[PDB]
Each structure stands twice: as structure tokens, then as C-alpha cells.
Write a protein that binds this DNA or RNA. Structure first.
Lengths: 49, 49, 48, 417
DNA sequence: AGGGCTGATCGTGCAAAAGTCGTGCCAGCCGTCT
DNA sequence: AGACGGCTGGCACGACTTTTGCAATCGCAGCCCT
């Protein structure tokens, strides 16, 4: 259950808690909040990008 | 179906004024979706279906 | 000229017929935003 | 040392057939075996953006829909046209009949004449191949698009009108007698029909993603190379050593017993994986014992292969080898083939030899390549050629190989020069 | 005080009925030549 | 213009494959029934 709660947290926000990386890449993943926030979120490129 | 109003009903939108935001509850969460996912499989390479 | 799928065809027809009339409808990216917001524990909808 | 039914020695072995052992064999389920292993490892305690262009034409179906919508059509007319466009196959022929379309309309005012008029307006659509009928109708549309200066256009039209059966059976005598066809005029008409763009919708669907699985490798660099059968893709999963130590350190005796049972299951899984790897290696060695000979000799020079003989050479259980052969693929420098395709059918051959059915089929295909284009080689001629090759295969065997090779009928494949 | 008896742990096969293929062979038919 | 021929394909019979449907009895001994 602790694994499951951690996984759900990472799915929501990986940058806040935990570090998930892809195969052969150490970069973090783009969680459901990552594509909302930052320069590469939905709100960006929404302002007529 | 008379096949004449079915197509026109597809191209329709409401006023959509006064957008509102709130918290989520499991019952209505169940309401939006139609299906329950139990398996982690995404696609089969045997038939690509 | 935006993601309005039901508007690009109609503007093209209005041009080729020389109508030059536009109906806004709704951008699809707004629906994208709504769908991704509803992916988390937050309700969001548009009233009348 | 030839006495019979003497004192019986005590048996020092058992069959010990376990459903666990059979599942361990998994009939070499490969990716399916990987999925089953994943499911078990999940059930076993203490075990273990992109570019996204998203841009493509909808096989011109979207283009056709836009063009029909681009043309001025009434709301009911637009709906009828959209329904007709929906009844379009990839080849470009209508799947449903006009009566089926009228029934789907479900309007008493809707009639056969109006539906036909709508289809005819739809028939002259934006791209080629919008006939939604037989290619002969599509051929007529192309000829209408083609210049009238083309020779034998009237003759081709007359043949396609009601002499299509004569053309299908390649009955040149009766067709010429009925249509007063001139000598070599049929050749010109056939050449024109060659440039008719049959199955035009196929060319529109230019996109075709490739699908292939690595499975076994037959690279065989410098001969007899141990090309691993996707060793990278092999799971080789192991149980959690830390959790096992926790189970070993469990205070509760029942918890320790449960951990011991889990460890026994993990050992069973490890034995299964090791057995799978060993079977794969042994099968690779057995294949390499003769695979290079078959590869160098060629497909037509393929010796028969017996599953029992291969198992005897490997000295393993014959049923085990048969199960391993199932659902197994072996990519090779020549190409990717199934393990059954890797095995060879048994057929008698002359001079004290055994010839594969695939070998005979490839020889027959090579012979068919060396044939007169005007007149296809007869099955009797194929049997004569096989007798020349000395493969001890008669007319029936030649016909079976041709069916394997999908050889066309002699009369059907026959054509003018 | 004496009998019943209960579950831990107990590891690469095979065969037998079924199926399926190799091979041959006959029956008709159409293209044909007489 | 009816028969020659070759094809094709169904029909049959042996010969090779192959798949699934198959696991007790322990030797401990304490607990429960008699």
C-alpha cells in the first residue's frame, strides 16, 4: 500500500515527491500536473502560442 | 433515426457561460467514465487491435 | 485558423462560395484543458 | 547376455509429471510466456515526451468527404453523399448495395432514382477509383478520363460491356469470334488495361508501418555463431533478495513457513527459466547442425526435417521438442520464419534422398519462372520438369506444391504475346 | 488409557487417440480436331 | 460435332506428428474419538 500511495503521488506530481526516470534517461517524467505548469504546460501555448 | 437530424445534432454547442470549478467525489467520478480498467496491457502485437 | 475542427471546413466553404461569414464555436484546446483538469480530483464544468 | 524376462532391476527414477513442469515448458509461449511470467511474479510474494506529430491524411476518405462537401450539395444531399462516402472500401468499391443504402436511409420519399443520381454525382468524385463498383466500371471511368485518341478504346469498351466473362477466362478464340477481334489488337487492349490503375485506393494508402518481432537470431557470423534468441528480451526475473532476508528474519513461525513456500515457488520459477534457456540453446545447436547447409543449398535444396529426429539428436524428450517448436519464431539473415517453417516436410526423392515439400515447391517456382509468357506451363509439363530434376514427385505432388506456391491455372495464366 | 489419522514435502514425460499429411487416382469438362 | 487430353479436385488410405491429461505416499505425532 505504501508503494501504491507513492506511485499515485508520482503520477500526480513526480517533481514534488520521488524521482521517476525513463529507460536510459535520467530526466523526470511529465505528470498530470507537469503538462499544466511550467513553460511547457497547457496554460502556455494557450496564450495564442 | 431519420438520418437527417442525426448529423446536425453532432455540430452543436451550448452557451457555456460562467465556468465553475469544485472538488471531485467518487460517485460522479464514476458517472463521467463508462469503463473500468483492470489490465495494464495497452496493445497486442499479434493483431494490432 | 485554430483547432476548431468544425470551423475550418465551414470557412473554406464560405470562401469558395464567397460568403465570408464566421461562427466561432469553441476551440478544441479548451476541451483538452477541461479533460486534463478532470483527470485529477477537481470537478469543472460550464453553466448556462 | 541374451536371456529374456530375467530378474527385474529396481527402478531408480520416476516420471514425476507435474502441471508445474508443463507450465514451465509453456509450449515456448515466448511473449505470451513473458506475460504469464509477469502475472505470476505479481501473484508471487517477494518477487522482483516524443515528437507526436499526429498528422496524416485519412486515406483520402477525409479528402473525399471535404471535396464532396466542397462541392455545393444540399443538406439532405450532403447527408446522402456522406452516407455514400461512408460506404467506401479501401480499394474504392462500395460494400453495400444501392438497395441497402436506400434501406439505411429509411425515407419513403427516398427512391432508387434519387439514390442513383446521388451516387453518380458521387461517382465522379475528386480522386480516381471513386467508381464504387467493379474495376471494369472503374476502367470505364479511367477511359472517359483518358483521351479518346487511344487505340481500341471502343473495342475495350465493348469487351468490358458484356464480354467481361470472355476476358476473365482468357478465351481468346470465342472472344475474338464474337467481337471480331483483330490479331494483336487484343494485345494492345491488354496493354491499355495494364495502365488502368487497378485498386487505386491502395496507392492512396501509401502509409504502411512495418511489423516484426526479434525472437530468435540466426546471424551466424563466421559460421555457428551463438546468436542469442533475444537474450535481451528474455525476462530473467528474480525474487526480492531483501524481502527474502526479511522472510528469513521473520519472527513468526507461520510467516517463516510462508516465506519458505514463496522461496520454493521462486526456485521453481528459476528452474523453469533455466530449463527454457537450456532448451533454447540446445535447439539452436541442433538447428545450426544443418541450418547453414540449408541456407547455402537454398530453399529449393531443402532436406526433410523430422521433429522426432531433431529431438533424438538433441537427446531430449520428443514431446518437449514438439511443444518448444510451437509459437516459436527464428529471424534469420534470409528472413524471419516460424519454427514449424524452420522444420521441413517429408517427401520421397530419388537417388536415396529426401526432399522437402517446400524444396519441391521452390524448384517448381523456379521452373515456372523459366516458362513461355504466352502459354503457362502445364502441370504435366511441371511433372516432366520434376522428372528431369529427379525428385520422385508425380503430377499430384507437383500440383500440391503449386497450390503451396499459388501457381495460376495454365489456361488462366495463358495470355496473348 | 488406547486407537485413528490427520497434512507438511514428495520436480523435463509421454502416449494414444486424434489429427493430419503424401501420394495416388478416378470422374467430369472444356479446348480441340477431326 | 463427338471424341482426345489434360486439369483439377474430390476421395481414399497408410505414415508421421502431437497434445492433454494425467501425482502417491509419506513418517513425523499430537489431537480427537472411544
Amino acid at each position: 500500500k505504501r508503494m501504491l500511495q507513492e506511485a499515485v503521488d508520482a503520477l500526480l506530481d513526480n517533481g514534488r515527491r520521488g524521482r521517476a526516470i525513463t529507460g536510459s534517461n535520467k530526466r523526470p517524467l511529465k505528470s498530470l500536473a507537469d503538462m499544466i505548469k511550467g513553460k511547457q504546460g497547457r496554460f502556455r501555448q494557450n496564450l495564442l502560442g | 433515426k431519420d438520418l437527417l437530424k442525426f448529423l446536425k445534432a453532432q455540430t452543436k454547442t451550448e452557451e457555456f457561460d460562467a465556468i465553475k470549478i469544485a472538488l471531485a467525489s467518487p460517485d460522479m467520478i464514476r458517472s463521467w467514465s463508462f469503463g473500468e480498467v483492470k489490465k495494464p496491457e495497452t496493445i497486442n502485437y499479434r493483431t494490432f487491435k | 485558423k485554430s483547432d476548431d475542427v468544425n470551423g475550418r471546413t465551414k470557412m473554406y466553404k464560405n470562401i469558395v462560395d464567397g460568403n465570408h461569414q464566421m461562427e466561432p464555436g469553441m476551440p478544441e484546446s479548451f476541451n483538452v484543458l477541461l479533460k486534463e483538469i478532470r483527470s485529477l480530483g477537481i470537478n469543472i464544468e460550464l453553466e448556462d | 547376455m541374451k536371456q529374456g524376462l530375467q530378474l527385474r532391476l529396481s527402478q531408480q527414477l520416476a516420471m514425476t509429471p507435474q502441471l508445474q513442469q508443463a507450465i514451465r515448458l509453456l509450449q515456448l509461449s515466448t511473449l505470451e510466456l513473458q506475460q504469464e511470467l509477469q502475472q505470476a511474479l505479481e501473484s508471487n510474494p517477494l518477487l522482483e515526451l516524443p515528437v507526436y506529430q499526429g498528422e496524416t491524411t485519412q486515406t483520402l476518405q477525409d479528402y473525399l468527404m471535404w471535396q464532396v462537401e466542397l462541392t455545393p450539395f444540399t443538406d439532405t444531399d450532403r447527408a446522402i453523399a456522406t452516407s455514400i462516402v461512408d460506404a467506401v472500401d479501401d480499394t474504392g468499391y462500395l460494400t453495400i448495395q444501392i438497395e441497402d443504402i436506400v434501406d439505411s436511409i429509411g425515407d419513403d420519399e427516398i427512391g432508387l432514382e434519387e439514390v442513383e443520381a446521388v451516387l453518380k454525382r458521387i461517382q465522379r468524385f475528386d480522386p480516381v477509383g471513386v467508381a464504387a463498383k467493379d474495376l471494369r466500371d472503374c476502367l470505364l471511368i479511367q477511359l472517359s478520363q483518358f483521351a479518346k485518341e487511344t487505340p481500341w478504346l471502343e473495342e475495350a469498351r465493348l469487351i468490358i460491356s458484356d464480354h467481361l466473362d470472355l476476358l476473365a477466362n482468357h478465351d481468346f478464340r470465342t472472344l475474338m469470334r464474337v467481337t471480331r477481334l483483330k490479331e494483336e489488337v487484343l494485345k494492345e487492349a491488354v496493354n491499355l488495361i495494364q495502365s488502368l490503375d487497378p485498386r487505386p485506393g491502395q496507392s492512396i494508402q501509401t502509409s504502411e508501418p512495418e511489423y516484426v518481432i526479434p525472437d530468435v537470431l540466426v546471424r551466424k557470423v563466421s559460421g555457428r555463431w551463438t546468436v542469442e534468441l533475444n537474450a535481451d528480451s528474455i525476462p530473467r526475473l528474480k525474487i526480492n533478495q531483501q524481502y527474502a532476508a526479511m522472510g528469513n528474519s521473520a519472527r513468526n513461525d507461520a510467516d517463516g513457513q510462508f516465506i519458505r513456500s514463496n522461496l520454493q515457488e521462486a526456485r521453481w520459477l528459476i528452474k523453469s527459466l533455466e530449463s527454457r534457456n537450456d532448451t533454447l540453446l540446445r535447439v539452436s545447436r541442433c538447428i545450426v547442425e544443418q541450418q547453414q547447409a540449408f541456407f547455402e543449398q537454398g530453399e529449393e535444396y531443402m532436406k526433410p526435417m523430422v521433429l522426432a529426429d531433431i529431438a533424438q539428436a538433441v537427446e531430449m524428450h520428443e514431446s518437449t521438442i514438439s511443444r518448444v517448436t510451437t509459437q516459436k519464431y527464428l529471424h534469420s539473415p534470409r528472413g524471419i520464419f516460424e519454427l514449424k517453417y524452420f522444420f521441413s516436410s517429408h517427401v520421397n526423392t530419388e537417388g536415396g534422398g529426401e526432399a522437402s515439400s517446400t524444396a519441391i515447391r521452390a524448384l517448381v517456382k523456379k521452373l515456372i519462372a523459366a516458362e513461355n509468357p504466352a502459354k503457362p506451363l502445364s502441370d504435366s509439363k511441371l511433372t516432366s520438369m520434376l522428372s528431369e530434376q529427379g525428385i520422385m514427385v508425380a503430377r499430384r505432388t507437383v500440383a500440391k506444391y503449386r497450390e503451396s506456391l499459388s501457381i495460376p491455372p495454365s489456361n488462366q495464366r495463358k495470355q496473348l504475346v
